[PDB]
Amino acid sequence: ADFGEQKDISEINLAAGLDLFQGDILLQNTRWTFPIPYILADNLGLNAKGAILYAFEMFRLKSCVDFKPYEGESSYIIFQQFDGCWSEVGDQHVGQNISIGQGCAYKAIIEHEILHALGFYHEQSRTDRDDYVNIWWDQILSGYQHNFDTYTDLNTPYDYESLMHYQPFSFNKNASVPTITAKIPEFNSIIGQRLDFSAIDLERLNRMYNCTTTHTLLDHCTFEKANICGMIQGTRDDTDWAHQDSAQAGEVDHTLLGQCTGAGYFMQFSTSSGSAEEAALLESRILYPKRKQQCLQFFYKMTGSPSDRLVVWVRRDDSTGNVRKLVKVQTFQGDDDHNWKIAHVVLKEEQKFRYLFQGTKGDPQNSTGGIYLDDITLTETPCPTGVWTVRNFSQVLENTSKGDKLQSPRFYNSEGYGFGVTLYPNSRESSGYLRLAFHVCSGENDAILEWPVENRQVIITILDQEPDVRNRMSSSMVFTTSKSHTSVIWDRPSRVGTYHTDCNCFRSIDLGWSGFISHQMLKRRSFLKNDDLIIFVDFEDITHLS
Ligand SMILES: *[C@@H]1O[C@H](CO[C@@H]2O[C@@H](C)[C@@H](O)[C@@H](O)[C@@H]2O)[C@@H](O[C@@H]2O[C@H](CO)[C@@H](O[C@@H]3O[C@H](CO)[C@@H](O)[C@H](O)[C@@H]3O)[C@H](O)[C@H]2NC(C)=O)[C@H](O)[C@H]1NC(C)=O
Ligand SMILES: *[C@@H]1O[C@H](CO)[C@@H](O[C@@H]2O[C@H](CO)[C@@H](O)[C@H](O)[C@H]2NC(C)=O)[C@H](O)[C@H]1NC(C)=O
Ligand SMILES: *[C@@H]1O[C@H](CO)[C@@H](O[C@@H]2O[C@H](CO)[C@@H](O)[C@H](O)[C@H]2NC(C)=O)[C@H](O)[C@H]1NC(C)=O
Ligand SMILES: *[C@@H]1O[C@H](CO)[C@@H](O[C@@H]2O[C@H](CO)[C@@H](O)[C@H](O)[C@H]2NC(C)=O)[C@H](O)[C@H]1NC(C)=O
Ligand SMILES: [Ca+2]
Ligand SMILES: [Ca+2]
């Protein structure tokens, strides 16, 4: 089924019958002291609470903005489920209300409302607007012309990619003719995006609040500089990892994939010579975690022996102040797929540490290759519960007919529920878009688990593949499993699901979004880097927010 098709704030508030300033602004110093105190109100639905907390994580992962639960502070933000989506711009000193209505529970919409509370206003309302966009007054609904009036000093250009900008179809009298068009033609496909903060959105936010760091980013490494991101090579090992440069025919670095000469560097450990169980260590610089859980993401390839082994280790403080204690975290091993692969590893370091990669030779004679590393990042966040790579996605998008589908591997959540994803690359329901939809899977735990599965938030994300989290605009969508999903869709998959021979399992009816992303949006940015599509999934209980 379709859950709910995505809608912009202008259409939501128009359907709710509001007449707010610039659509979502209530008018009745202006800069906040971090952390901003918040109250999640009783009337605010369970999905909305979880989505607001997920939006606060995005702020702590891209900015120095921070939020705390209320304790009797003077100024605060109270989040409620009144009519429409709206916010009061800037600190009001006595507290302010942010409204997240029905159909308003989306990362990009909540980020937009929080940016109003931080004191930002829409981009088409800047005095310089007329130089960058056309406003088609003859296409606006009568009485709504004031929503296009012009109304600071952060010294930045006009941002067509801004999370604050209105869509081409804002307040239209006709559904086919836009009220806004860009004076640079390419941007008619871009204006009014609902993915993430733009780069300029973050630069303005940083200039406004004196930010130069991020609460939940520890490290990243593309290996493009000569000092290799402060990583070092030990001597309690047999050999060394080489810093190769994409020059050799048929070898290309993940960061650039051969788009530039001389640039594009990866770490390599060769396995085609010497003796078995020879190894090499690559070790990070010392890191000081602020939270008790971290996620290490990286890209790798293994063209060598099936007996070769990439292993991730941590070295941590021995409790005297010396980072010398080892823990083995994770092991990776090869198969017939010689393309680049993505890996995620959970770390739980409460004290200072260094993350380590060990490459190991297996049978050197049955090896004609090596272990390859690029594009690391380390964030003070959970890892994605499931990850699905779809290969040759451009070829899939040309070959699949409307209503054909792909299905993921079966994943498992921390509670033990099985889940997966259904992808229709060519939608029948929205022509020119993907449909991504969630399904629950039968698994070995089904007998002890509660049914139907309810109060469990699903987050689906299409990864932007850019190595620095600040620069990423990953498309994201959220729902909470509910009793109201009937055709309850979330009952035990043996009773309400269809058996499939690929997973050897039952899979539920799919629920999610037609029009998750357009084909045009996937063909830009870094969503289809290497012609690989990467989808992330979480399936997490939010009943503790009740
Ligand atoms: C020698 O190594 C090959 C493959 O390893 C190769 O090493 C270098 C030459 C590389 O450049 C690559 O070409 C390659 O990594 C071994 O062949 C492999 O055997 C395994 C185990 O039988 C196969 O895995 C299985 O394959 C079957 C289907 O055939 C599946 O049903 C199983 O689920 C499982 O995946 C693997 O596919 C196969 N690979 C190839 C390319 O043939 C070979 O066994 C090994 N020989 C010795 C003496 O160790
Ligand atoms: C947040 O919104 C609520 C609801 O609109 C405001 O409470 C109202 O306050 C006015 C003025 O005191 C009263 O006339 C209404 O009867 C109140 N309504 C309700 C349901 O309480 C509240 O003042 C707003 N401000 C904040 C930040 O709490
Ligand atoms: C919205 O605009 C579209 C595009 O101009 C309108 O479609 C045209 O309508 C006129 C009058 O019926 C026809 O002569 C054209 O042949 C239509 N062109 C296309 C491309 O369909 C549409 O009717 C408009 N809708 C409203 C309510 O005004
Ligand atoms: C994606 O498409 C490419 C191109 O067809 C595939 O690469 C070919 O793989 C076959 C079988 O191994 C080789 O004989 C060709 O020489 C390869 N061509 C090129 C240009 O590399 C690739 O395997 C496909 N990937 C997947 C997994 O779908
Ligand atoms: Ca060494
Ligand atoms: Ca690189």
Author numbering: 35 to 62, 72 to 194, 200 to 535, 542 to 600
List sentences quoted exactly from the publication behind this structure:
The zinc-dependent metalloprotease meprin α is predominantly expressed in the brush border membrane of proximal tubules in the kidney and enterocytes in the small intestine and colon. In normal tissue homeostasis meprin α performs key roles in inflammation, immunity, and extracellular matrix remodelling. In contrast to meprin β, meprin α is secreted into the extracellular space, whereupon it oligomerises to form giant assemblies and is the largest extracellular protease identified to date (~6 MDa). Here, using cryo-electron microscopy, we determine the high-resolution structure of the zymogen and mature form of meprin α, as well as the structure of the active form in complex with a prototype small molecule inhibitor and human fetuin-B. Our data reveal that meprin α forms a giant, flexible, left-handed helical assembly of roughly 22 nm in diameter.
The zymogen form of meprin α is plugged by an α-helical pro-peptide that sterically occludes the active site. The pro-peptide forms a small helical cork which plugs the active core and thus sterically occludes the active site. Cleavage of an exposed flexible loop, defined by residues L61-L67 located distal to the active site, releases the pro-peptide and exposes the catalytic core of the active site. Accordingly, the steric occlusion of the active site represents the major autoinhibitory mechanism. Secondly, the zymogen is converted to the active state by proteolytic removal of the pro-peptide. Comparison between the cryo-EM reconstructions of the latent and activated states reveal subtle conformational changes about the M12A catalytic domain. The subunit is a compact triad comprising the globular M12A protease, MAM and MATH domains. The meprin α M12A domain is typical, containing the catalytic zinc ion within the active site.
